[PDB]
Design a protein around this ligand. Structure first.
Ligand SMILES: Cc1cc2nc3c(=O)[nH]c(=O)nc-3n(C[C@H](O)[C@H](O)[C@H](O)COP(=O)(O)O)c2cc1C
Ligand SMILES: Cc1cc2nc3c(=O)[nH]c(=O)nc-3n(C[C@H](O)[C@H](O)[C@H](O)COP(=O)(O)O)c2cc1C
Ligand SMILES: Cc1cc2nc3c(=O)[nH]c(=O)nc-3n(C[C@H](O)[C@H](O)[C@H](O)COP(=O)(O)O)c2cc1C
Ligand SMILES: Cc1cc2nc3c(=O)[nH]c(=O)nc-3n(C[C@H](O)[C@H](O)[C@H](O)COP(=O)(O)O)c2cc1C
Lengths: 445, 445, 445, 445
């Protein structure tokens, strides 16, 4: 029984640790090719299954209506490179590492999505993944500028038709269609390249895709989104799921809930790999590790933290003085109008303590509220990973980076070898495709 | 006074020579990263200014409305990779070569175009170019599933506002906005990052762009489109122009006309570089060159040739038997209703002879009618490039490949050194950016 | 049953074709890393078993005790880079291709040879080869400050002990000696690293080697030397043999002779792979190919060919006039005292005739007298290779380059795919080491 | 006025910190190409002047003529790859970084040293350096099967002629000798390529060298050897000096003495750059750094230090009891029969206390006695480098690695940017050669 490992970070200034760009070890090379090439090569040296990128299309002015926080202090999406370009860059200099990009079904037509990932899948020789998200934000809306705003759960309904359209397109070409018979002049068998002719309620695409199928057949479908409608969506489509849980109990529930949704949709639950995100901080001794973590968490500015907390909760908390205690917010707006997730974050993060908005945002900024921080030696981290795996937390772990590129160098040089020595993580790539690393079947046309 | 050199080929089976995939030397590696990496490194080894890719978003299927000729025999766009992914791949393995991609203003929002190229421009450290095109044909639309028919000249009017929007977005970040002051916690100066708030007749985008400016400020604007409206457009926006002319008389006229449009738009004509395309075929002796050219041209299948000729002429010629002579086509449609390009191509390619459709399509397939074929020794090709340059044909030449990747290995190894010894082509890159190679000024925010 | 392919060229101006540096396509980049990196990456792209380099440690100056000819016209070894440095350079940018260097047993101590190749073998993860040679020439000696005389056959007797010393050194480290037990503080098992204490008639070396064994155990032994003593030496030590024969029948005879020597030495003949050198000249048509061979052969200066002919035959022909007829030299030297190779060359070149030594030197300069020039289409060349292989000419072919880097780009693009489609050449590397490519066993400690 | 930076480490298990291979972060990849490619790319990313490697031609078995200590516990030179091969590997994947290798004048002929470094200088396009050393040890002489023992100072006398011989060889080719006139058939001007025919007291070399001059003319001469005879030697030949001093006071004296010896040799002291070695240990806080230093030092086994200390003293400490008080040991020899370096070191223990032999060996294993360990934050390390530089300690610093590859990643990511912000270290390479980086003149032929 071996676990999977994945890397994850924004093509930009911040991922989960909101003080990361301030870290003494941060190169902040996120505008340069070299930065991404170093990181991709490092994770491949550590035999990672994959690396994938989140995405948002707007700087967030969202809290509360301003960039002065985001841009001035380095909040979420202050810098955000288009993710598919970035992984093409990474694909060019690796040969085994799987690579994923987050693209919303909202903003692009299925033809575009299908061709972009089929192209990347071929260029990388069958190593690509699309992380499917159904987001719609007005600012993103403001940027791409389209306002018909569809309700959260209906976006997933549309996304069902979207995925079907994309997969029809990826099946345009039989895997034996291309002939390249030079002598005879037969380029391809036109009876094995078929029109798509899709017309559903939401979308219309004609086809065929002008891009044949790679050696893994189709890109791997990644999925992120844990809403009840999102888990149903994952049951039907996800081949790997991006999850975040603060502790083993929540990890195990999410795991079993997702595997249940998959089985309920008629699919094999062992063909959907669940990853849970964890943020390790290493030290030669546990003491050093805990001091490094303390240093890391002290870089978070209370307002950048609050900004993200405002965005994730849907409540704008900039409207209040920063010293407002959380119970004066519930007092001021009534418990019915303060999101549950926000009341559950205040209770868990404060431990019963009535915290100011400053301190709540500061703590939220350390780890986005729910990504577990693990401080310890390489041996301790290896142990924790192995025991969570054995307790059924996940099929693999996403390693959320405290600072870049350095943390991945530390994790690969110190933690990966220990995992290999215990026999719970690959010593070498067995196959060449992302499907093979993940133990997924090669889909048929 | 030095000339410029550019590479050009589709990320796919065919560019201008319709027998290229059948050439004994063709690797047909156009689905692999390696193919593109080899070519990009080769052109950088030869100190080329740039390489750019065309694009079409559908298998050309009009003649007449079928997969079978295009796919079966390997016509235009039978395989067509998404071009921006492809040059991202090339950028990761080069450090000087300029890289361009053709993207239509029709099918994407200005926000997308701006973010993709800003990303590539940053990933490549200031080496990227967008080749602006305004196309819109029904099959591509059928894929993007849209009902629109903006008339040709109106597409250019919309493109004016489009470019304006993209350039506003690329000016979101001043070049001194990014601070990365870790000690003070100041990421960036928010007074140097500006909202865009563009609301024009055609488009609306708010901004700012989440991507700072590269060391060359903004991507270089390439343009392709030689219609009277397109030349006006080039006058206003183009920093480099993609042109194709069958002989020196037409090259010089196109040259002077473009430079005139640029001056008429209030811009400096020497800040718009005109490239003209030529298809060289080398041999150790002139005799060897001519036999290789004859071999190359003998690979063109008459029906693939005819397919492209139909698409370009706007006339479906599948309806006729292949042995139909061209004058029964003129009889069948009336001299008035025969597109001018089609009448000029028939007269030029036949030299007055009445040709079958097979033979007309076959000759069109050799060079898309109007790309000059130059057979000779390295010294002769070098001579011809120099004399055309001295005769005011162009500021630079696009080298259309008879077959890939080999032809570029030959060109870089045999012709480039001769140009360098004569002092008309750079022996080494003087700058690091595409603007520096082309001698373009660094634009202000 | 598949054939093997090897590349072979001098790290310098000339290999077998003496007009190569003058070829219009020759880059003459033999002083730069880029030149060697390109060729290695190209031969790896073509799935070649290996690439190796010859060596001489002095500008040939025997004819006529001066460098005016060698240096002035670009003769053998006019430029000659140190070969182990070069293949280290190639190893760094490849991961499958085997890489070999010729080093003479005469000029270096066994410890030095062992350490250099053990190092390269580790650096390349098991892809290195030593081409064993026993040369001793005075100019080389003059350079090394040696005033050593040892007779041809005795040099080989000495080499037997040399090989034995080197192979002991490569067994210094057991393959399980290295522990890297950090926690316990045990670097390596001291009972599995052993002193050598070699004290023989010729050499003494103590050991152990400071370099452990790579994944292929030991560097592959290549050998070049076709003399009667040379074949015995190959019989005992060679794992691969570099041979040259002018036609299939002699190829076949040398082939069986070497396999017989291997069997006579008590070894398995299928564990010594025989390569024979061939010089292909490709053309799209046979006519083009023959014109290209004619062009290439016309670049040879009669005196450079003659210079080389002198060095291989042992007679310095410089003293004679260029119009000295060949039977007038044997008249004044007797059937008894002019070398055997020298007139199996003259007759073969005339096939009957009396030529001036100018003409004899010119013809020798094209292909070093005995390397067959094969001009044809890719299909014909592929046919001939398969046909010679099936006829028992060799286990593999050394592809002698008419000019560099260009000829290898053509061969990999045109001939290799044809071999692969016929199933007689690997479509992909099955293993990672040079031993696995050659189908050699992993030697024991 | 900027300081220079150099990297330095053995191609093997240990450099100065003898517990390094045991460090949790050490990859111990010293047998793989990847390990060296990574370190070299990292130092190039950090704009280092140079990286050079030490060497020994035998496993360190002196204490006590057995390998059980050296091999069993991982003392210095237990694994030691041939250094010229290693830097060739590094040169292939870098384009600016300087690269040097240590080769003894004792064991190789001048022709061999000359050709290897001329070859490397060309492969690297002028970035190479030879670190001149005059060592002669018994284990090493018995691997090369040498039995002549030359007195310490005489080896340096021999070395004087050695360098003249090597520099003569490097002037074999005029920098305008190579012509490559393909049309005229003139390879090179033979009157600009000269025989050497060097015959002095010690050595004889004929020439010419088969390798032309690189872009920087000749390899840079590094030297290491601080005996009085070594410093006179450095005065005459060295262009950069490797020095080690435990504090600013000794640094400054060593600095000024070397500059004087150079002036005394009639050379410009500004044209010989002196480097001093320091071993930094970084932490996010000073507390963290001091702890990481403690961890590092706690990995040192007392006997490996002594194994290594035996050779440096050159006294064999192997059979004195480990708890032998040092002074008591002092007595059999007589204060007069004690090598001094060891003696100051006893002094440099710094407690001036009678110390166990275990304990002297432990401390020596820590930092080779005299390389200062600096623990602190990046700012503190930068400060100390700047303040030492300004106080005239050295023209540049050698950064001795606590553990590899990681410490260089930390150093380049944390300290270099700070040095750059202060303007005391280059933000970018101004030239392409090692001579340009060090501010050395281009020597003429
Ligand atoms: C762990 C995780 C990571 C996510 N990352 C992104 C992301 O990078 N970009 C995005 O648009 N949506 C992302 N989402 C999904 C958003 O929640 C999104 O707004 C979607 O509409 C709702 O997903 P949901 O099922 O959580 O409601 C992520 C969701 C999860 C659970
Ligand atoms: C040399 C040249 C190359 C062109 N390449 C493309 C291309 O690759 N893709 C595309 O959509 N349009 C391309 N075009 C422009 C097409 O003509 C396009 O349909 C546009 O609507 C009309 O441009 P026009 O000004 O030539 O009419 C190119 C035009 C020229 C002159
Ligand atoms: C095909 C072939 C290639 C050879 N290449 C070299 C070489 O590059 N350098 C060298 O010193 N000897 C080379 N030799 C060996 C020389 O002939 C050498 O001087 C040796 O002492 C005699 O080899 P022999 O067995 O052919 O007589 C080669 C031999 C053969 C058959
Ligand atoms: C900082 C430094 C580093 C040295 N490194 C080496 C080395 O790696 N290999 C070597 O043989 N000698 C090295 N030496 C010099 C040795 O002492 C050498 O054996 C020589 O014979 C005597 O040099 P000396 O002048 O210091 O006595 C080094 C010397 C110094 C000062």
């Amino acid at each position: 029984r071996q676990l999977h490992l994945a890397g994850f970070f924004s093509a930009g200034n911040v991922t989960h640790a909101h003080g990361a760009w301030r870290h003494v070890g941060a190169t902040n090379g996120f505008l340069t090719g070299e930065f991404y090439k170093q990181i991709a090569r490092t994770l491949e040296r550590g035999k990672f299954d994959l690396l994938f990128l989140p995405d948002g299309l707007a700087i967030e002015d969202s809290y509360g209506d301003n960039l002065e926080t985001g841009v001035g202090l380095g909040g979420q999406g202050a810098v955000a490179l288009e993710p598919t370009s970035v992984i093409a860059t990474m694909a060019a200099v690796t040969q085994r590492l799987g690579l994923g990009a987050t693209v919303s079904t909202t903003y692009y037509p299925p033809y575009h999505v299908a061709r972009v990932f089929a192209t990347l899948d071929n260029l990388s020789d069958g190593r690509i993944s699309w992380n499917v998200v159904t987001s719609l934000n007005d600012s993103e809306a403001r940027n791409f500028g389209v306002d018909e705003h569809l309700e959260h759960d209906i976006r997933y309904d549309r996304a069902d038709e979207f995925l079907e359209a994309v997969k029809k397109l990826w099946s345009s070409w039989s895997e034996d269609a291309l002939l390249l018979d030079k002598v005879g002049g037969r380029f391809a068998d036109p009876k094995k390249v078929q029109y798509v002719n899709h017309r559903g309620r939401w979308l219309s695409v004609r086809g065929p895709l002008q891009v044949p199928r790679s050696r893994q057949g189709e890109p791997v479908i990644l999925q992120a989104g844990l809403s009840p409608r999102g888990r149903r969506f994952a049951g039907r489509w996800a081949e790997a799921v991006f999850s975040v849980s603060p502790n083993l109990d929540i990890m195990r529930a999410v795991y079993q809930d997702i595997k249940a949704h998959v089985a309920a949709a008629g699919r094999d639950p062992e063909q959907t790999k669940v990853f849970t995100a964890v943020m390790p901080v290493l030290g030669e001794t546990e003491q050093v590790a805990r001091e490094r973590l303390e240093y890391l968490n002290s870089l978070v500015h209370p307002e950048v933290g609050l900004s993200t907390l405002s965005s994730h909760s849907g409540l704008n908390l900039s409207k209040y003085p920063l010293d407002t205690k959380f119970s004066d917010i519930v007092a001021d707006l009534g418990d019915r109008h303060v999101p549950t997730m926000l009341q559950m974050f205040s209770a868990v993060a404060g431990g019963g303590a009535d915290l100011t908005l400053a301190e709540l945002g500061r703590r939220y900024g350390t780890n986005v509220g729910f990504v577990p921080q693990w401080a310890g030696t390489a041996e301790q981290i290896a142990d924790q990973l192995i025991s969570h795996f054995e307790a059924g937390a996940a099929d693999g772990f996403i390693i959320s980076p405290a600072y870049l590129p350095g943390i991945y160098e530390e994790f690969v040089d110190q933690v990966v070898p220990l995992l290999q020595q215990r026999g719970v993580f690959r010593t070498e790539y067995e196959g060449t495709t992302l499907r093979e690393h993940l133990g997924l079947a090669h889909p048929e046309v």
